[PDB]
Symmetry: C3
Subunit: 483 residues, 3 copies
């Protein structure tokens, strides 16, 4: 007659690694890496992205004839641009501090186009001839919608002197431009005056632009260029313009209220009519895990980006003193095996099992819950002449990856070694617990099993489970069986 | 007739957490997170803050009339500027590379204002009428004090050609400016000549400033602007000024000796006449504790900022099997025995042990605290409105490190808290196995950590077991079969 | 008779630290910190760096007379510059976006000099008189080799209009410059035209340069300055020049193919005809170790840089059986046995237990080493004097990362060394318990980890664990009569 101690086993093929052991099959495990995304582009905390479709921020702000004319959405969480937008600046040129405009515009609380300078103004200049085949619309030379390319009237370009006082109680993005002529004959044809200037002045601005009449290479069929510039007029200030030529005037402006920052995402994915707290260019993440492998460039409260393909934490017994585990036990992690004629089968320690499941559950939940995330946009906004600042971002991003990867990977290895010793310690505690309540009525064979001199009743079996066994009641019976 | 092995207990209400257990009341513990600051702005390593008050670094340098600081301080460790300094540039304008000047001027070993171009010079120009109500002094038109606004004399502005050769052994901070006049008449009225220029040349500097005459908005009452520029003249180089008009010319300059860096702090806290190693905008920290939760923007040899509100390590043991419940009675040690016989009773501690524990856990707390390597650092923002992307780059780094330290520090507590408690469970079990290894046949195992000696328990064998000199042949036959 | 379980000890003086103990002497150890370097500058992944000697990138590119005319380096992995390169820009001036050019030119797959505008292309201008003392070859006045200083011919300077179309299939780096004169007399003398300009236009480039004529101090004996600019002409684009004076024209240009980035290294070490994955200014590293301390500014796949002098992991035993005994005698194993019978006395090892620990300890070492195989390429420093704020950003970052790696590395070594030592303690106790679980009634526990044999024992009887199930009743009667 005998009794043994044992641990649970199942069909699980899940394999974990420890700091000292590799490829250890376990009964239960948990991965703390999120590898899943929804594959769509969603709202971020209830606000929809501004999806510019084959347009750039420049083509949308200035009025590229082939960009959407109306701003349907008054607010966005992020701007979604295609990798190499097709439309941009139809008339070749430049937009000043473009990348900083895009950061300001990446998340806007309120956006609303308003007419600031009506074409009714400029009665002595021409408002109708300012078109180019570079900016085509419906088979006709057109031009940017929200600015005006003024031209000479009757071989006369009177100097312009115009002001706009912001009465709107909100900041105003205002845009203007300079046309760089290509020869001295072209200059006088478009603007009678041969030497020209643009003077822009606000409370914070003092600008003089002068054309650069020079030979350049054709882009979009034109050798001319247009350089655009922008300012924000604060709620009760004025902007003052003066020019005798080469003035791409403002017609429409945009009311801006800004309370937050995010980034421009370069993605071809499509809107999914969903909501998310974490967004990648490949898709959105719905996870509470600490780490992920979906994409570097995320927006929102996102898991940490690591280089690991799997991060699996053992939460159970090793699966096959006791030579092996009991596939037969089906009601607890730690248990007893009884052998008497009255009955046969297995049994399991209720309290010890729940203590351990709470133990490993709290170990996992801590690792997950201790991670706190800051809303952050990992997008990158730098020019061809800002490539040294680009590497700082790369160094930062890459360094945190190497940190988060090494820490997460060794946390798993270390804590799995602790998780496994935790199990084998609990079982031996039950073995010794039985050994002390069975001092002389038992012998040790070394296989986690005792030798019953006494005849253990099923009630005795349960009396030893409770620990309510009385050794005096059966001490003499052992002396009889012995020798 | 039994002897029991047990551990210490007290009245502690302090709780710690571990990976597998939460809200566990323990006897002794230590918090490695510092939360307290002195509420005042202090000196740093024995050097004093340049507490500029309601005046910008620009206003003080150029000599805004409304600021009472001239050569008050010759050495500083950090600058304190208010969030929106009231005075700044009294005449509307700008200062080029201001944010970089504030970095250069952030820590200066030697600063001295020296007159460099005297008003005795410029004898063909008017040095007396260069005032504006924008710069007001005591209700009367005034101007910046370390610079001279030169206007016409006798309806003439002869061209200025002047030079200054640094005869000092220290580098010099020299400041000049340009007036952008509002209309063609105001140009002629202030400087006879209609079209003007400012050339500035050194060994590194080649400048040409031309005025921008344009309609602009009224700031501090004037539609005009003055834009200021700066250079550092090396010890035997010379600066060369040529101007037709519109020249704001240097009268004074500053001798500069720089040997380190430390940002501009934004605070309204006041000088406490103290010294610190670590300065927050809300106060100062005097701790060896490795982590802190007071302010992000710290200047000095500082701990590491975390989002934690509590980072309590556990130095002792648990509080109310081998010890079904701990004994509150023991006051002299962490690990100890209890004797039960008519001769005597009570709880008695161990000395080879208990101190071994104290020494080991305390070395653990010190090892965590000591291995933090402190780098003097300045966390402060010096980025303007068109440098927000570099500013986000800064915030991403700052936030990335916060999240790195917070996670590791909290898991380190949770992980090392479990090992501490299991260390204590291990220490008790060793002594129980030693008592069983001494007495073998003469006593029986009860199972509650309380050995039962069939033979009468001896106060004299107590210290004997404590040391292991107990003799079992002495009482072998005695109570060989005491029960039947 | 007697049998005893013990562990190994040797002559090792190697000491380690745990979280709870300090200077613990161990039998075996392993350092995961690399301190050895090659002491020379090597190839980086099979590609030889460009060592520019005492010429700067500007001097090499523009053709300082005192530099190698050209070199057979079409490809290079990084650029090695001296701390203060001597030759640089002989004629005083500037190169625009120099630090970005050095980044672009830092790793280049194809670099070839080609002649884009011949001296034949300047019929009505002088190609030969454009020389200066500041730029000297053999004491003789010379000038930059790859650009042409064009001056008047026949007291006349007809305005220039030249265009170059990049027929090649690679990008071209093109350089040009403007000459700032000193006085109006200088201007007319070299360029009859008093008021001059330079327009440069490509598909993306729209430039107007105009000379600044002012007095400046002497640098390299000349008070004038020459400011240089660059662009990258794309295949099938054209560059269009126009000037009536002060034009330092392009003569040669560079065919560039760029596929990567890798900083300029400031170093004086000599080339070693070696190859390495990691290069340091002091020398090269050939290590798989996770961390190092050789120098911060490394380029290549490199260990993490920490502030530690040693990071020693315990891989062995505590060194001076299971109770208070380190056996120097058993050289044959790690865990082992000692027998004391009438046959003799000697030492034995347990191979099934010794190997289980060696395999596990090597995994501890290997896991810590190999899990940080997230080595990536890296860089050094590249910012100017008006870029100190961005330079601080770099420093806060690489310092902050240093504080993260050193604190994490050291605690890991302290934590796992504590765990290693405890892991050895549990192994011997299980050997003791194996021998204890067998031979239960036939032996006496003496308190030293050694058992007392009541019955007589043979060398063959011990048999270590070879049998492992020595007959419980074969000698049970003999020990029953050995009782008293
Ligand atoms: C309409 C056209 O194609 N014109 C074309 C001209 O036309 C040929 C002519 O040479 C030949 O003798 O007779 C043919 C009929 O039998 C036919 O009429 O061919 C010359 C060949 O070199 C072209 O240059 C010329 O094209 C115009 O050239 C202009 C100057 O170079 C300029 O590039 C014109 O482009 C526009 C544009 O579409 O952007 C024309 C716009 O109306 C004009 N807008 C404004 C507000 O002025 C715009 C502007 O001038 C420039 O963009 C400013 O830099 O240029 C191009 O059609
Ligand atoms: C001088 C004056 O009071 N001007 C005044 C103007 O004319 C008055 C008139 O109202 C009164 O009836 O009779 C006076 C004669 O006794 C005189 O004719 O009235 C207008 C009404 O709107 C006032 O705005 C005007 O004020 C002056 O206007 C100037 C030009 O716009 C200028 O803004 C003056 O400000 C100063 C300044 O205080 O900054 C005056 C300084 O002395 C002057 N400093 C220097 C070195 O030249 C300074 C300078 O011109 C500009 O800052 C350069 O841009 O301007 C303001 O008082
Ligand atoms: C020709 C000469 O040596 N000039 C010399 C001048 O006159 C000497 C005199 O000292 C000596 O005693 O007798 C000589 C006759 O036998 C002659 O009369 O003396 C002054 C005294 O200070 C010297 O500075 C002066 O030296 C020249 O001065 C120039 C104007 O300041 C200029 O700096 C000359 O430098 C060069 C140069 O080497 O860079 C001369 C180059 O040929 C010239 N190159 C071109 C393409 O024009 C170059 C150019 O003018 C400037 O760099 C443009 O800014 O300047 C220097 O020798
Ligand atoms: C400023 O004056 C000093 C002292 O005169 C100049 O330094 C040189 O000093 C020697 C001896 O004192 C003089 O003989 C030289 O004339 C000076 N060198 C030169 C090249 O001028 C210093 O250079 C002067 N600075 C300038 C550029 O005016
Ligand atoms: C420089 O030359 C190349 C090849 O001539 C130019 O590319 C064009 O080649 C096509 C071939 O069908 C010609 O029809 C066009 O005339 C060429 N020019 C254009 C404007 O497309 C290249 O464009 C020329 N570069 C410049 C800007 O002049
Ligand atoms: C493994 O055992 C579980 C019992 O819960 C069973 O549901 C599952 O189907 C088994 N898997 C296989 C492949 O038999
Ligand atoms: C604009 O008008 C507001 C009142 O509407 C006035 O306070 C302000 O001075 C004006 N701004 C300018 C500079 O024209
Ligand atoms: C340690 O012992 C071994 C074997 O006897 C020997 O090879 C080695 O030289 C010894 N090391 C020292 C420092 O004595």
């Amino acid at each position: 007659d005998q009794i043994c101690i044992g641990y649970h086993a199942n069909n699980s093929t899940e394999q974990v690694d420890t700091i000292m052991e590799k490829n250890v099959t376990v009964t239960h495990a948990q991965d703390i890496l999120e590898k899943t995304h929804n594959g769509k582009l969603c709202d971020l905390n209830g606000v929809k992205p501004l999806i510019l479709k084959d347009c750039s921020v420049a083509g949308w702000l200035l009025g590229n004839p082939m960009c959407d004319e109306f701003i349907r959405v008054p607010e966005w969480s992020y701007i979604v641009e295609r990798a190499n937008p097709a439309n941009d600046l139809c008339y070749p040129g430049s937009l000043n501090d473009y990348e900083e405009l895009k950061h300001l515009l990446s998340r806007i609380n309120h956006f609303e186009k308003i007419l600031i300078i009506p074409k009714s103004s400029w009665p002595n200049h021409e408002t109708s001839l300012g078109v180019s085949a570079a900016c085509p619309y419906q088979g006709a030379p057109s031009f940017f919608r929200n600015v005006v390319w003024l031209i000479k009237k009757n071989d006369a370009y009177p100097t312009i002197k115009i002001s706009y006082n912001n009465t709107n109680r909100e900041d105003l993005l205002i845009l203007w431009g300079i046309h760089h002529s290509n020869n001295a004959e072209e200059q006088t044809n478009l603007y009678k005056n041969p030497t020209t200037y643009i003077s822009v002045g606000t409370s914070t601005l003092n600008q003089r632009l002068v054309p650069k009449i020079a030979t350049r290479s054709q882009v979009n069929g034109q050798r001319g260029r247009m350089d655009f510039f922008w300012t924000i007029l604060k709620p009760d200030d004025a902007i003052h313009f003066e020019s005798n030529g080469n003035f791409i005037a403002p017609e429409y402006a945009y009311k801006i209220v800004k309370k937050g920052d995010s980034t421009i995402m370069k993605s071809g994915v499509e809107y999914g009519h969903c909501n998310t707290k974490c967004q990648t260019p490949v898709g959105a993440i719905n996870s509470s895990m600490p780490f992920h492998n979906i994409h570097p460039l995320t927006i929102g409260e996102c898991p940490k980006y690591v280089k690991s393909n799997k991060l699996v934490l053992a939460t159970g017994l090793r699966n096959s003193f006791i030579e092996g585990g009991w596939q037969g036990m089906v009601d607890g992690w730690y248990g007893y095996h009884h052998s008497n004629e009255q009955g046969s089968g297995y049994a399991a320690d209720k309290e010890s099992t729940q203590k351990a499941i709470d133990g490993v559950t709290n170990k996992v939940n801590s690792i997950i819950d201790k991670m706190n995330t800051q809303f952050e946009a990992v997008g990158r906004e730098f020019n061809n002449l800002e490539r040294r600042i680009e590497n700082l971002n790369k160094k930062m991003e890459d360094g945190f990856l190497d940190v988060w990867t090494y820490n997460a990977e060794l946390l798993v290895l270390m804590e799995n070694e602790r998780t496994l010793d935790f199990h084998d310690s609990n079982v031996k505690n039950l073995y010794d617990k039985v050994r002390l309540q069975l001092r002389d009525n038992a012998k040790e064979l070394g296989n986690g099993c005792f030798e019953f001199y006494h005849k253990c009743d099923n009630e005795c079996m349960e009396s030893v489970r409770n620990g309510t066994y009385d050794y005096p009641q059966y001490s003499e019976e052992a002396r009889l069986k012995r020798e």
